[PDB]
């Protein structure tokens, strides 16, 4: 039932790496402060997403055993998970509790950010399904690690090596779900089910960016490697 001492340490190490990310309030502060034009919002997105990828690579390199994977398979895991990790982190930020009325304004700012109408409704559906799960910061960090270490990405040559890195994290996440929510014995499965919804965003992410309601879609060199754009 309990976490073993090694699992506590593992969880204990992953949270520290996860918290190197930009603080949620830094992000929601900028958005809530002024309304921006769709062009300024696009720039804010590419700047945010470039910083996010940089930190995600440092987080990924600290995952136990990742650095002993074949070098081509390491690239394939990062490329295959970067967009999913960005939306999971966006959902975490969106669901942070804020002073009265702030989340409504944040939703309106995002609705009016320049993103295409086609995409606003699924995005909020996913954010809202993520908020219903009442995840802790440890659960977000673990889920991000599990997303990154997915053996079923393309071009993974040695899935079996990746599986043995993913499984200890799945075991810890399952123990937390039983501890943190013993009345809901479907909670672990529901977290894992949300991952399949994340994968759909990865598959539409290019069109989501190019349909942004701006005249030019300029991406940074790092984002062009990670995203299927330009």
């Amino acid at each position: 039932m309990e976490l073993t001492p090694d699992q506590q340490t593992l969880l204990h190490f992953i949270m520290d790496s996860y918290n190197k990310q930009r603080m949620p309030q830094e992000i929601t502060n900028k958005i809530l402060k002024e309304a921006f034009s769709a062009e300024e919002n696009f720039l804010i997105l590419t700047e945010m997403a470039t910083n996010h990828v940089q930190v995600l690579v440092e987080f990924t390199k600290k995952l136990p055993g990742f650095q002993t994977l074949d070098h081509e398979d390491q690239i394939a895991l990062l490329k295959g998970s970067a967009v999913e990790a960005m939306f999971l982190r966006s959902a975490e930020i969106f669901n942070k509790k804020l002073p009265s009325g702030h989340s409504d304004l944040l939703e309106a700012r995002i609705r009016n950010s320049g993103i295409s109408d086609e995409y606003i409704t699924p995005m909020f559906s996913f954010y809202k399904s993520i908020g219903e799960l009442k995840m802790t910061q440890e659960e977000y960090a673990l889920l991000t690690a599990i997303v990154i270490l997915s053996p079923d990405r393309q071009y993974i040559k040695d899935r079996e090596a990746v599986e043995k890195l993913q499984e200890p994290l799945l075991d810890v996440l399952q123990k937390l779900c039983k501890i943190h929510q013993p009345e809901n014995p479907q909670h672990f499965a529901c977290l894992l089910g949300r991952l399949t919804e994340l994968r759909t965003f990865n598959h539409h992410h290019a069109e989501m960016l190019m349909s942004w309601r701006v005249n030019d879609h300029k991406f940074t060199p790092l984002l062009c490697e990670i995203w299927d754009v330009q």
Binding site: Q54, V57, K61, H71, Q74, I75, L78, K79, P221, L222, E225, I226
Partner: peptide
Amino acid sequence: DHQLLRYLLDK
């Protein structure tokens, strides 16, 4: 081709 990524992975 994935050079910036390959670079950040090695540094």
